[PDB]
Structure 1
């Protein structure tokens, strides 16, 4: 077994402007986002490759849960703004929570909020109790700990529920998170009217993202003039490119090299002028 992480991020705005939802939520499994929800549509929607997954989650019921989450989250923001007596201002509360497993064993958990970018309050499950960092968080803490069962529920969420949810999602996400998709490569060249000729090597449609792409000139690894990459969440694939400029009078042999975890050995793709 390897490392898997489940992370949720909530963002609330006390005075949202036109076309920006007051509350937005997203969730990621490792490097991929699997769902989103906002206060405009009010629907939890799967994303990327999870749009094709069936039976992992009942999105209609999750929608109801997120609405309840949104309500409490925004009330928390409202209370903070009230404490500072600044509702005419535009403020933001962001919360991050989730857990991780490694070798099928819980290996980490976190739950922390930030107000206007500064640490606000976080849960320490070993105590177990909330830890305030901002003066207003002392009030929030008092409310979140008004009955003995509240900290017990918070501890159970990080230690029992969240990892159970991750394990479940992993059962339906094997063909997504554990893929070893080999890269397709395409070499191409371009001539800028007046500038040198440049050779572009592109590796695409691969996963995971870790990859080694480099050009060689007569077997000599070259220094790229421009390099870049991207992750397309819709597809769950990466693309990575490298570019070199070639002397107007160079005849040497150019070849692109690609090494990736899904390949039995590296690939070489020479460029034919």
Structure 2
């Protein structure tokens, strides 16, 4: 088996402006986002290729869960501002948590918070306890450890529930995270009035993202003039391109090359002037 990670990111603003939700949550599985939730619509919604996966999660229920998470989160943000006596200001609290497995074996877990961008508090499951980094965190810690169960629960969340959720999801996501969709390529050219002719090699509809794309001028690998790539989350696919400018009198042979993990051997696509 390989590496898999389940990450969540919560964002809360103490004085949100118009059109910006006070609370936002999102979740990822590896390099893809599978869900989202904000305090405006208050609904946990699958995203990307997960919008088509059935029976992996009861979104209606997970929404009740996010609403409850939101309440605690925003109360936390509220208490920090109350502590700095600055409710007139605009502040942010960000949370990060999740885990990762490698070869079906839990390989890591994390739970950390940031206030106005600085480390606020984080959970150390080995102790187990919260570690304050900011003075107001001393209060927060006192609250999250007011009963013996609490840390026990937090430790149980990272060591048992989270990795269980991740495994459950992997069961329904093989057709998503384990894909090896081969790249479709397209060589194209454009002549800018006054400029040289440029050739653009495009690799698309492929996954995983790791890919090798380069041109060759007479069997000679060229230095790209431009270069970019993108991940279309709704699709779960990448696109990577390269662009070379060609001398207005060059006659040499131009061919594009693509190497990807899903290919038994590299691909070549010459440009026919």
CA drift at 1:197:
0.1
Q: Deviations over 1:122-180 (max 9, x none)?
A: 00000000000000000000000000000000000000000000000000000000000
Q: How many residues align?
A: 273
Q: Deviations over 1:194-242 (max 9, x none)?
A: 0000000000000000000000000000000000000000000000000
2 CA distance for matches of 1:244 and 1:65? 51
1:85-234 alignment runs, 5 A limit: 85-234=85-234
Q: Secondary structure in 2 aligned to 1:136? A: helix
Q: Secondary structure in 1 aligned to 2:87? A: coil
Q: Secondary structure in 2 aligned to 1:173? A: helix
Match of 1:12 in 2: 12
Q: Secondary structure in 2 aligned to 1:172? A: helix
2 CA distance for matches of 1:125 and 1:72? 21
CA drift at 1:254:
0.1
Runs (4+) off by over 3 Å:
none
2 CA distance for matches of 1:34 and 1:212? 27
Report the RMSD for the aligned CA atoms in angstroms: 0.2
Q: Secondary structure in 2 aligned to 1:227? A: strand
CA drift at 1:25:
0.1
CA drift at 1:83:
0.2
2 CA distance for matches of 1:19 and 1:258? 43
Q: Deviations over 1:52-71 (max 9, x none)?
A: 00000000000000000000
2 CA distance for matches of 1:90 and 1:245? 48
Q: Which segments of 5 or more consecutive residues in structure 1 lack a partner in the other structure?
A: none
2 CA distance for matches of 1:235 and 1:258? 21
CA drift at 1:28:
0.2
CA drift at 1:248:
0.3
Q: Which segments of 5 or more consecutive residues in structure 2 lack a partner in the other structure?
A: none
TM-score by length of 1: 1.00
2 CA distance for matches of 1:145 and 1:201? 57
CA drift at 1:272:
0.2
TM-score by length of 2: 1.00
CA drift at 1:27:
0.1
1 CA distance for matches of 2:95 and 2:63? 18
Q: Secondary structure in 2 aligned to 1:99? A: strand
1 CA distance for matches of 2:257 and 2:65? 48
Match of 1:28 in 2: 28
Q: Deviations over 1:179-204 (max 9, x none)?
A: 00000000000000000000000000
Q: Secondary structure in 2 aligned to 1:239? A: strand
